[PDB]
């Protein structure tokens, strides 16, 4: 891709300052998802809490005490009515933000899994996909409590998941180094992607919904195409060898944000595969990052318990 997309002039050096800082947690933060209003963001951590911040005023609009402390993921429904969280307890608990009693409360504990839940994403207010620890993904219906469409077929355990913007399909990644493009309505996998040496830890759709990047423990981000069924680009660079914990695109797609375990996040020009900028805020592993759907701000959480919001 770099031989084609080198005629476009480069983005220049990107300098961003920590426009906010969301303190309060007492452990490693593992997840963060924006809202579709681009103002509220939820963020979960190993201290038993997940906290629904207001990104503009740095106010904590909620803090939800969880029944088991071990929490790997969170997702924020596009209505704003629901949140979700799941970890080693094998239960993707679901919380109702918009109650009349004024407080959040657990709606359903979704059980029936023989592994830890790696990731959850909301389709609608009634449909939620997850990514488990028994090498399978699933799709739950919250009203019944029964798993609708179980996705079996990986050999090593699955590690991430990324719904498309139009939410008809999604992509999940695993320890097989095989990203698979499942399909929500029919219920079978369509495409399987290889090209990583070892386990993959992070998947994010391109904003058109027709591609996705993949962050792995091999210090390689690799953007794949779903139509062309093969690897497209290998965003990697010398002198760095550590793992990648989270990836996310920009709104246009021009800059992709990669979260390394050199303790700082790097900002990759998605067309020339150049490290375009360095986000050197954190003092431990950047475990989650996310970009607003409006494309204005980029929040990044990490294991030093500090959500920084860059712009």
């Amino acid at each position: 891709l770099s031989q084609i997309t080198n005629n476009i002039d480069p983005v220049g050096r990107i300098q961003m300052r920590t426009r906010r800082t969301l303190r309060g947690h007492l452990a490693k933060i593992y997840a963060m998802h924006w809202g579709t209003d681009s103002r509220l963001l939820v963020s979960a951590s190993q201290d038993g809490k997940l906290i629904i911040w207001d990104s503009y005023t740095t106010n904590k609009v909620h803090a939800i005490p969880l029944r088991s402390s071990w929490v790997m993921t969170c997702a924020y429904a596009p209505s704003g009515n629901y949140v979700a969280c799941g970890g080693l307890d094998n239960i993707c608990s679901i919380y109702n933000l918009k109650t009349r009693e004024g407080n959040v409360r657990v709606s359903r504990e979704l059980a029936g899994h023989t592994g830890y839940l790696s990731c959850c994403r909301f389709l609608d207010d009634n449909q939620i996909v997850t990514s488990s620890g028994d090498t399978t993904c699933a799709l739950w219906d919250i009203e019944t409590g029964q798993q609708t469409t179980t996705f079996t077929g990986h050999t090593g355990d699955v590690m991430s998941l990324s719904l498309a913007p139009d939410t008809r399909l999604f992509v999940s990644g695993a320890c097989d180094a095989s990203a698979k493009l499942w399909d929500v309505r029919e219920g079978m996998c369509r495409q399987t992607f290889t090209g990583h040496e070892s386990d993959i830890n992070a998947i994010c759709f391109f904003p058109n919904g027709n591609a996705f990047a993949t962050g792995s423990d091999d210090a390689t981000c690799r953007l794949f195409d779903l139509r062309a069924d093969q690897e497209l680009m290998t965003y990697s660079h010398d002198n760095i060898i550590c793992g990648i914990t989270s990836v996310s695109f920009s709104k246009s797609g021009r800059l992709l944000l990669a979260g390394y375990d050199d303790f700082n996040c790097n900002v990759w020009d998605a067309l020339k595969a150049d490290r375009a900028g360095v986000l050197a805020g954190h003092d431990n592993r950047v475990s989650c990052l996310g970009v607003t759907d409006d494309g204005m701000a980029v929040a990044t959480g990490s294991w030093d318990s500090f959500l920084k919001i860059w712009n």
Partner: protein, 39 residues
């Protein structure tokens, strides 16, 4: 399945969307919601 056409699609999509993108274009800091306004 013709990877050159597909990466060209990614290229024309982003170069269509690159201008109005509020992060690669940048901020004018007065339309920024993350002006601090504090003391």
């Amino acid at each position: 399945m013709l990877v050159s056409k597909c990466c060209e699609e990614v290229r024309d999509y982003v170069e269509e969307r690159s201008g109005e993108d509020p992060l690669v274009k940048g901020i004018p800091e007065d339309k920024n919601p993350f002006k601090e306004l504090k003391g």
